[PDB]
Amino acid sequence: KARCSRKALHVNFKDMGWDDWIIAPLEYEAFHCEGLCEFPLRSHLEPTNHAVIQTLMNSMDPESTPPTCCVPTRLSPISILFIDSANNVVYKQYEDMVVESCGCR
Amino acid sequence: KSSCKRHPLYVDFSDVGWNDWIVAPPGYHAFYCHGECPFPLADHLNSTNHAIVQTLVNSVNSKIPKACCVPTELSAISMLYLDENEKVVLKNYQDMVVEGCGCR
Structure with missing residues (x-):
């Protein structure tokens, strides 16, 4: 599903040039969040009341x-x-x- | 700058069918957050260590998206409704109005 989920993201400090200060670790798994925020909104992604309202308003008029x-x-x-x-x-x-977890905000 | 900013958004309660429940107010300003996050270390963009790193990865690798502009401080708002005994009652609702935006 193109729904809001967690994805792999390998961070390499050598590629940014921070070998210079950093000794270890020089690489780690950071993950990132990508995906669609739309109804239905899974409640275990604890969406804020504001996020619910914005989803409603976007559901009613996606322009503006x-x-x-x-x-x-x-x-x-x-x-x-x-x-x-x-x-x-x-x-x-x-x-x-x-x-650790993603959500809609 | 089309960068991460707060934007006006007024939710009218007539227009969603809630004004026969909420006697007051007739609506409220929620606002929304939208805009680009190219430099989340800008003091005014409250940001996370994660947003900064990810935005850095993005400049070298376009397939990793940049950090997203979202609310970072929300305030409550109060409404008035009718009791089970038709008494006017106030009720506070948390996390409803954007006070500040940021990159996450």
């Missing part, structure tokens, strides 16, 4: 009002080992790096 976007609704972190602006080695947890 567009549908909601498939985007992440729960994220998890990864920890990165890298070298500081001060040239130290550190291990920091970065929030909102991996998509």
